[PDB]
UniProtKB/Swiss-Prot annotation, chains A, B:
Member of the two-component regulatory system DctB/DctD involved in the transport of C4-dicarboxylates. When activated by DctB acts in conjunction with sigma-54 to activate the transcription of dctA. It comes from Rhizobium meliloti (strain 1021). It is found in: Cytoplasm. The lineage of its organism: Bacteria, Pseudomonadati, Pseudomonadota, Alphaproteobacteria, Hyphomicrobiales. Phosphorylated by DctB. This is C4-dicarboxylate transport transcriptional regulatory protein DctD. The gene is dctD. The modification 4-aspartylphosphate is found at D51. Transmembrane segments: none annotated. Residues 2-116 form the Response regulatory domain. Coiled coil: none annotated.
Length: 139, 139
């Protein structure tokens, strides 16, 4: 499983990366949503975990960009208590889930695992449909 | 989307059922986990939402029974603050997610929708594999 992790808090990002890696995830951490987005595509087999607030492109801006690329590429928003209402609205808008700070390591893991599961199922579904069409065309 | 809803609190169960129905779910509500389990099978296309505590078969007992029937049939546990640690352990054990009481209607909806999404993808995956094998055998 893979994760693109974005947060402006250097220390929090490192703690989050270590937790995810020890949980079996391959993590790519970024200090900027823009840099992270550059590596994303509808072919990305992982998930995105981003703070809702960033000094540059914020978390919701990144979310909208991801939604356009592939609505089934899960985005988990990391948020402070004050912004929870915004995160809840984002979920209604298509975001996968949110995790409120401060959060426990095992909780970050359970949230990421649910998102990875959705992405794994979506990619498996697409792979199966590709095979069906490939077989159908051959015949 | 369908949901098997189990809770001992008659009033809470009715409020939950109304919220889910207004969110587009077809709901079957039960006052006993035993009665609910009787209608479940690996063919069930919906999800289960159960209180972790019940005077008879409790929520974790129902969870273990469901896990045996089909680990991919999502179970969401409804829990009081005091039992959250037990719910977290249940998730580590295979449960889908948990919702803490008191909870807002829109939050119950977002949790149920994520679970329904997993089940929908799982059933679609199985349907596709069935078709592939059916085609392969015919040829």
């Amino acid at each position: 499983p893979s994760v693109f992790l974005i947060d402006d808090d250097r220390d929090l990002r490192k703690a989050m990366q270590q937790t995810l890696e020890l949980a079996g995830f391959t993590v790519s951490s970024f200090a900027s949503a823009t840099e992270a987005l550059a590596g994303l595509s509808a072919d990305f087999a992982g998930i995105v975990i981003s703070d809702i607030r960033m000094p540059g492109m914020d978390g919701l801006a990144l979310f909208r960009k991801i939604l356009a690329l592939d609505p089934d590429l899960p985005m988990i928003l990391v948020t402070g208590h004050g912004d929870i209402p915004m995160a809840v609205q984002a979920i209604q808008d298509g975001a996968y889930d949110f995790i409120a700070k401060p959060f426990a390591a095992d909780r970050l893991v359970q949230s990421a695992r649910r998102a990875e599961e959705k992405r794994r199922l979506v990619m498996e579904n697409r792979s199966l449909r590709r095979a069906a069409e490939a077989a159908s065309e051959g015949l």
